[PDB]
Amino acid sequence: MRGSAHVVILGAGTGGMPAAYEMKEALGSGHEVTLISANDYFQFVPSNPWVGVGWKERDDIAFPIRHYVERKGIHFIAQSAEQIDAEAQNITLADGNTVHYDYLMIATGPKLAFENVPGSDPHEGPVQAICTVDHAERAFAEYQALLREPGPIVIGAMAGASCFGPAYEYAMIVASDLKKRGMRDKIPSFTFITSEPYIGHLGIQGVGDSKGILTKGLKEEGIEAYTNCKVTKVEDNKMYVTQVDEKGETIKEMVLPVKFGMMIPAFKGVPAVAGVEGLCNPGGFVLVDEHQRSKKYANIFAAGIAIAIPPVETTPVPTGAPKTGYMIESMVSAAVHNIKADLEGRKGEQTMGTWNAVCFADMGDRGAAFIALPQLKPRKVDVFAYGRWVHLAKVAFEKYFIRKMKMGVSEPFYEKVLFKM
Amino acid sequence: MRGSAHVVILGAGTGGMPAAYEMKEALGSGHEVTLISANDYFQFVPSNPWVGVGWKERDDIAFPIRHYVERKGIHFIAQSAEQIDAEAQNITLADGNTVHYDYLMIATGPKLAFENVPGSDPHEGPVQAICTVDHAERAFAEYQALLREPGPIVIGAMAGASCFGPAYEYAMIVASDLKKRGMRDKIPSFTFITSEPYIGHLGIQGVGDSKGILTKGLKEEGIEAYTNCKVTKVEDNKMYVTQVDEKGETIKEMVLPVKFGMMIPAFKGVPAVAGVEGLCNPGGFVLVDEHQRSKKYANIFAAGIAIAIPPVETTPVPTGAPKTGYMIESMVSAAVHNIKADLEGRKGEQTMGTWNAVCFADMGDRGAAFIALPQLKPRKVDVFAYGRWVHLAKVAFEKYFIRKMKMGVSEPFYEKVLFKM
Ligand SMILES: Cc1cc2nc3c(=O)[nH]c(=O)nc-3n(C[C@H](O)[C@H](O)[C@H](O)COP(=O)(O)OP(=O)(O)OC[C@H]3O[C@@H](n4cnc5c(N)ncnc54)[C@H](O)[C@@H]3O)c2cc1C
Numbered sequence: 001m002r003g004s005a006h007v008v009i010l011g012a013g014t015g016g017m018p019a020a021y022e023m024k025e026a027l028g029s030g031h032e033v034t035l036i037s038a039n040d041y042f043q044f045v046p047s048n049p050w051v052g053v054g055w056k057e058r059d060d061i062a063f064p065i066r067h068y069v070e071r072k073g074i075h076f077i078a079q080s081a082e083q084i085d086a087e088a089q090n091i092t093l094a095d096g097n098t099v100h101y102d103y104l105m106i107a108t109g110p111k112l113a114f115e116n117v118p119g120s121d122p123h124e125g126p127v128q129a130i131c132t133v134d135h136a137e138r139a140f141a142e143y144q145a146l147l148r149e150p151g152p153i154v155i156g157a158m159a160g161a162s163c164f165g166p167a168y169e170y171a172m173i174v175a176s177d178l179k180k181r182g183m184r185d186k187i188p189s190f191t192f193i194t195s196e197p198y199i200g201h202l203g204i205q206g207v208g209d210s211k212g213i214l215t216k217g218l219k220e221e222g223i224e225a226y227t228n229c230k231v232t233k234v235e236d237n238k239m240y241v242t243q244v245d246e247k248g249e250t251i252k253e254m255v256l257p258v259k260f261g262m263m264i265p266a267f268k269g270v271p272a273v274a275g276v277e278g279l280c281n282p283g284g285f286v287l288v289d290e291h292q293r294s295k296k297y298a299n300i301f302a303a304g305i306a307i308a309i310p311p312v313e314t315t316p317v318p319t320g321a322p323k324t325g326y327m328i329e330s331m332v333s334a335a336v337h338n339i340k341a342d343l344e345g346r347k348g349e350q351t352m353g354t355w356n357a358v359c360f361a362d363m364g365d366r367g368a369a370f371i372a373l374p375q376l377k378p379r380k381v382d383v384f385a386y387g388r389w390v391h392l393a394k395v396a397f398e399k400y401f402i403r404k405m406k407m408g409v410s411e412p413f414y415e416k417v418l419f420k421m
Numbered sequence: 422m423r424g425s426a427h428v429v430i431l432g433a434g435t436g437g438m439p440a441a442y443e444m445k446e447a448l449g450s451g452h453e454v455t456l457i458s459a460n461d462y463f464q465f466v467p468s469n470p471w472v473g474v475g476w477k478e479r480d481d482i483a484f485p486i487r488h489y490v491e492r493k494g495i496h497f498i499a500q501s502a503e504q505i506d507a508e509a510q511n512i513t514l515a516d517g518n519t520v521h522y523d524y525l526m527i528a529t530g531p532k533l534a535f536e537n538v539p540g541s542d543p544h545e546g547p548v549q550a551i552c553t554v555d556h557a558e559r560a561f562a563e564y565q566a567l568l569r570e571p572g573p574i575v576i577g578a579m580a581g582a583s584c585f586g587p588a589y590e591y592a593m594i595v596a597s598d599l600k601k602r603g604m605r606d607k608i609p610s611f612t613f614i615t616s617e618p619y620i621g622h623l624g625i626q627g628v629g630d631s632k633g634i635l636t637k638g639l640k641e642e643g644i645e646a647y648t649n650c651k652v653t654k655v656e657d658n659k660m661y662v663t664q665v666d667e668k669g670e671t672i673k674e675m676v677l678p679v680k681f682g683m684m685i686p687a688f689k690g691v692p693a694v695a696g697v698e699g700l701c702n703p704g705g706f707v708l709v710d711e712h713q714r715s716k717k718y719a720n721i722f723a724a725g726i727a728i729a730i731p732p733v734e735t736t737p738v739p740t741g742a743p744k745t746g747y748m749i750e751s752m753v754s755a756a757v758h759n760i761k762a763d764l765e766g767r768k769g770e771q772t773m774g775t776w777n778a779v780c781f782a783d784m785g786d787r788g789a790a791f792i793a794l795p796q797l798k799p800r801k802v803d804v805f806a807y808g809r810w811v812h813l814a815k816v817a818f819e820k821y822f823i824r825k826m827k828m829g830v831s832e833p834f835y836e837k838v839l840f841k842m
């Protein structure tokens with residue numbers, strides 16, 4: 001209000017949850033912090049591929065938000081925003097209620113654009129998805145139906161996708177789970193389809209020897225792999241794939257039967273955010289400046305997958321670069337600090353810093369991880385690692401992050417890196 | 422050098438010339454400022470369409486650089502950079518000589534991408550260009566050859582172009598010049614082809630009533646107009662045009678004979694800059710941050726058409742947004758201030774400010790001008806004006822800008838706006 005600003009945070013995910021705590025901590029008792037989110041529970045997204053092969057249960061990676069944020073003085077509304085009026089600064093919720101804000105922080109993550117590919121929606125076909133825990137449980141269910149009645153497998157990533165790690169990870173743990181059940185030899189074919197220009201491109205033009213190691217890993221497991229692919233439609237339990245060459249010209253078309261399938265979809269901005277005029281690029285991602293502030297509305301900030309990051313490369317089949325957890329945190333921190341300063345007559349000069357991608361994938365007893373920065377080669381850090389220690393690190397970090405979402409966050413969030421001192 | 426940094430400015434155009442003066446002024450006698458440019462003369466680019474119909478002479482809009490910058494202590498090298506080594510911080514010139522720098526400011530403007538359209542190069546066909554004074558003189562020459570032997574005219578802008586004003590302006594003054602010579606009725610057809618989704622889109626989704634007024638202006642002059650066009654090739658004195666619809670689907674193909682033609686080309690980054698690894702987007706435009714600093718090299722800055730600005734809209738046929746003079750100046754000012762601060766232990770926090778487009782077109786006794794900001798609608802200023810006063814303003818500003826390039830620049834460059842006090 002007129003002297004004690006009301007700060008609304010939209011989306012209680014990887015960026016939104018900590019943003020609510022950090023926001024509340026920074027603003028203190030004199031300001032209202034409201035967290036709005038479509039679900040009443042928080043999920044740890046990087047654990048979803050394991051849920052999708054049944055190595056993890058929902059109960060292990062998700063929990064109810066309300067008590068933990070409210071014990072902190074944050075108001076929680078478990079409702080989806082349907083409309084945003086930036087002029088009037090009102091948010092219309094699904095139930096019709098409206099919420100007013102003085103500052104909006106948008107952390108709504110991705111809309112899964114199943115509509116780019118007719119038939120590709122998990123509910124209308126064999127092609128599943130593992131990005132949300134609801135979808136991963138459903139993926140597991142179809143996985144069990146493959147066990148009872150074996151048929152061809154197709155795993156991969158769609159045109160326009162930006163999140164390739166999980167596709168490779170899921171392909172590997174499925175192959176692995178098939179072996180551990182002695183069922184692997186029952187599979188007619190096992191294909192990996194990706195829009196990447198080559199295996200291990202990962203949306204980032206490769207990191208370390210990702211090409212060689214992912215290539216060998218796929219061959220090792222008897223998975224046939226195709227790149228520069230776009231799926232045009234899913235129909236009659238068949239995936240229609242077009243493969244192009246360096247200059248976008250078609251070099252073949254394939255029709256693949258699928259009994260069990262998982263393709264990572266392209267991400268768009270959610271409709272409520274994409275619907276705000278002049279706020280977003282054509283993909284529905286919020287245009288912001290270095291400080292996380294909307295270019296159009298000075299009291300709207302944004303962070304996480306929700307924001308637009310300009311492409312630095314152009315591939316035969318459209319692909320995007322990933323937005324990963326450490327960079328999301330830096331964006332969150334910057335947005336909070338800069339809002340706090342708006343409330344105190346300063347201009348917040350904090351930025352998210354250097355673009356970077358960090359990803360960790362657990363395969364069982366060991367994992368793979370990479371770090372790349374900045375976005376364009378030649379990089380200052382370009383490492384791809386595999387080992388048992390990646391597994392331990394993933395396990396520890398999940399445990400840590402979830403504990404922090406329950407206990408609360410101050411916080412220069414990543415001093416997990418005090419394992420030096 | 423080790424304590425008195427050497428600042429090189431690449432490109433002596435609308436942004437580069439003032440950047441050299443402002444740089445020298447800000448750094449004083451203790452630092453070396455070198456200006457490198459492919460031509461030994463400065464040209465006033467906005468005057469080129471008039472040169473292309475013969476209303477202006479080269480001698481009126483261009484002048485030799487050397488004396489004016491050297492009398493200011495700036496070193497001038499009238500040589501084109503062929504290669505840039507960002508690691509070693511050396512620039513290789515056309516003649517083989519190399520120049521070392523501690524800070525590089527890149528202001529090289531556009532490469533005219535005639536190669537996007539086979540046959541479209543001015544030297545290999547009837548399709549001319551008016552972006553450089555050399556090309557506009559050549560355009561005028563072909564214009565006189567049309568006078569002696571009348572045939573079809575085709576004026577417009579290519580796919581990927583970002584500079585539409587001048588196409589409309591040139592079409593109008595040609596029509597006008599035809600009338601004043603009583604030759605207008607000798608023309609079989611007069612076609613206007615543009616990649617814009619509609620007339621008066623101007624790369625900026627329209628400004629004021631540009632649609633209605635440009636539409637009417639073209640009809641008024643008997644010019645037939647097509648939008649959503651891309652020229653695929655120029656061959657045998659014929660332009661091959663494909664017109665698409667809202668979803669990129671072809672709704673017709675045309676083969677147009679041309680006796681006289683002028684299409685604005687798509688712009689790319691020049692090869693020396695585009696060739697620096699990791700410096701540029703796929704178009705060869707320098708990736709910079711709000712402060713004009715290269716994202717990859719902390720001692721490389723950039724300004725003007727040379728820098729990359731992310732798209733905010735997506736059209737059926739690829740088009741770009743314009744980079745116009747006031748915004749270029751703001752970029753220049755920011756880059757200079759921020760370099761000066763790098764030389765003094767500070768961090769320069771200056772930015773170019775709000776995106777904006779300002780364009781003035783003289784038609785003879787009157788002109789048209791527009792101002793739009795910021796880039797995305799709804800805007801804070803969205804005006805399209807026509808009148809005799811636009812003409813006077815254009816004339817005055819040309820006179821002013823050229824005088825300033827000769828006398829020198831301090832300078833919060835635009836206080837021409839003191840016509841209020
Ligand atoms: C399968 C998978 C694996 C990943 N693995 C890694 C990894 O290993 N390491 C890493 O660093 N990152 C990884 N990522 C990438 C990234 O870190 C995650 O996607 C992360 O969850 C993104 O955080 P976010 O806050 O932007 O979006 P999210 O975590 O998706 O949060 C968005 C929230 O907004 C809510 N929401 C959506 N629409 C509305 C609405 N209209 N109104 C109200 N609320 C709404 C959603 O319910 C959700 O809670 C992974 C991504 C996925 C999909």
Ligand SMILES: Cc1cc2nc3c(=O)[nH]c(=O)nc-3n(C[C@H](O)[C@H](O)[C@H](O)COP(=O)(O)OP(=O)(O)OC[C@H]3O[C@@H](n4cnc5c(N)ncnc54)[C@H](O)[C@@H]3O)c2cc1C
Binds near residue numbers: 470747
């Ligand atoms: C026809 C036309 C009309 C325009 N009308 C308007 C208008 O009315 N108002 C407005 O505000 N703007 C207008 N513009 C847009 C814009 O202001 C101009 O294009 C402006 O000149 C851009 O300035 P710049 O410094 O980035 O590039 P330029 O002015 O093109 O300068 C680039 C310089 O770099 C040099 N160079 C190129 N390569 C090398 C190399 N390898 N080594 C060394 N030097 C090199 C070139 O010789 C040139 O001198 C117009 C543009 C054009 C083409």
Ligand SMILES: CCCCCCCCCCCCO[C@@H]1O[C@H](CO)[C@@H](O[C@H]2O[C@H](CO)[C@@H](O)[C@H](O)[C@H]2O)[C@H](O)[C@H]1O
Binds near residue numbers: 172214360385386
């Ligand atoms: C995190 C995002 C990346 C994508 C997600 C995960 C993709 C799946 C990875 C599959 C890799 C499988 O292939 C595996 O690779 C490494 C080679 O580097 C081999 O391992 C080799 O290097 C490792 C160390 O890095 C040594 O400990 C080992 O002694 C050596 O054999 C394994 O013997 C091989 O089995």
Ligand SMILES: CCCCCCCCCCCCO[C@@H]1O[C@H](CO)[C@@H](O[C@H]2O[C@H](CO)[C@@H](O)[C@H](O)[C@H]2O)[C@H](O)[C@H]1O
Binds near residue numbers: 590593
């Ligand atoms: C600067 C970038 C924009 C593109 C470059 C230039 C494009 C060419 C412009 C062609 C316009 C010709 O059409 C011209 O438009 C205006 C209408 O607004 C009319 O003019 C009308 O409005 C003006 C004021 O704005 C009045 O002074 C006038 O009394 C009235 O008739 C002219 O009678 C008409 O002849």
Ligand SMILES: [S]
Binds near residue numbers: 131132
């Ligand atoms: S999903």
Ligand SMILES: [S]
Binds near residue numbers: 164324
């Ligand atoms: S990802």
Ligand SMILES: [S]
Binds near residue numbers: 166322
């Ligand atoms: S990833």
Ligand SMILES: [S]
Binds near residue numbers: 281308309310311732
């Ligand atoms: S973007």
Ligand SMILES: [S]
Binds near residue numbers: 377378379382
């Ligand atoms: S690299």
Ligand SMILES: [S]
Binds near residue numbers: 533557
């Ligand atoms: S040109």
Ligand SMILES: [S]
Binds near residue numbers: 584587743745
């Ligand atoms: S332009």
Ligand SMILES: [S]
Binds near residue numbers: 584585586
């Ligand atoms: S323009």
Ligand SMILES: [S]
Binds near residue numbers: 732
């Ligand atoms: S860009």
Ligand SMILES: [S]
Binds near residue numbers: 799803
């Ligand atoms: S607007």
